[PDB]
Amino acid sequence: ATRTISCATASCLQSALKNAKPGDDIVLAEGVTFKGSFKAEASGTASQPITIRSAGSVNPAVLSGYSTGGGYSLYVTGDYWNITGLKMTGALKGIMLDHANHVQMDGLEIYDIGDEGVHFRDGSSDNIIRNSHIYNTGLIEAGFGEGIYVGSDKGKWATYNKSADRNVISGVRIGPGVAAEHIDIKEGTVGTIVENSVFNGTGITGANYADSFIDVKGNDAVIRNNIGYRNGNSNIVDAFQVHVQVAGWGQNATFTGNTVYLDQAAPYVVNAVGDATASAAGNQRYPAGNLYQGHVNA
Ligand code: NA
Ligand code: NA
Structure with a gap:
């Protein structure tokens, strides 16, 4: 590191973020809960x-919101942050990225969140979240309780850049709760990888x-080598869906090497609705049952 800043209080962390420089190593004390709305801007x-x-x-350090x-x-609104080994809790959103690029999130535990756990927004591209666990989201609004949310709905494309592209989700555990x-x-995102x-x-x-x-509304998504457990939850109708919210989106989704445990025969592995397009190979379904619906090249 170029500079080490060792913090054990929220005030130390706030100052370290405000004064952050390339090469800084902001090292947060084990066992401490840092309460704030922290901003990684540089x-x-x-x-x-x-x-x-x-x-x-x-005993990882914890970043907690106030409510x-x-x-x-x-x-996170700047580029080239490594966010490592932290817990995040106690806020409406866990980690929000706006126009943030080449951020690496690794070893995180994100939980007890009002709405969504992680959101790549406003053009945030070329990021990765790996080796992390997201659970207990949607405590305030279930319908805004996604684990990981990539991009923006079409109604917000005039507000936020839709092209939150080439983001990678690798070796993550999502759920329960x-x-x-x-x-x-x-829709509007290109090249998301979930592996x-x-x-x-x-x-x-x-x-x-x-x-x-997973619901795939972006393009060129690659959904590979994942395992999904329905666990008897009747609210889960399909393992994976693809939808078209804007013509020419929900296209070219690829599903390979996934294994899904869907309890009964009715849920689909990939339900590509309407004009959505997907390719699939090497997916395993338990028990025997419905495989693909829609424009799925198998
Ligand atoms: Na959703
Ligand atoms: Na759905």
Whole structure:
């Protein structure tokens, strides 16, 4: 690191973020809860990232908001942050990224969130969340309780840049207690990857159409080598869906190598609705039952 800033109070962290520089290593004391609405605004580079991390993993540092009904645990608006080994809780959103790029989130535990756990928004691209667990979301609004939310609905494209592109979700556990989709990939996004992840469907509510592990409304999504457990939750109607919200979106979704445990024969593995298009290969369904619906090239 170029500079080490060791913090054990919220005031220390707030100051370290305000004064953040490329190459900073902001190291948060184990066992401490840092309460605030913390803002990661500066930008690093690939060679000089800005790091916020827990000092160790026995008792990770916690970033808490003030109330599940407001704010965020962390709001990232700059590029080239490494956010590592932290817990995030106690806010309306866990981590919100606005126009933030090349952010690496690793080893996070994000839980007890009013709305959505992680949201890539306003053009935030080329980011990764890996080796993390998101659970207990949608405590305030179930229908806004996604685990991971990529991009913006069409009604917000005039407000936020829709092109939250090439974001990667790798080796993540989502659920239980995630009230909406585990992953909602919005129209306007391109190239989202969801890989090597595990979906515990207990707690998906069905609110606001949220009745699958993943809904794919963006393009060029790659959904590979994941495991989904419906766990008898009747609110889950399909493992994965693809929808067209705007013509030419919900296109070219690829589903390979996934294994889904859907309890009964009725849920589909991939339900590509209407004009949506997908390709599928190597997916395993338990028990025997419905596989693909729609324009699915199998
Ligand atoms: Na749905
Ligand atoms: Na949703």
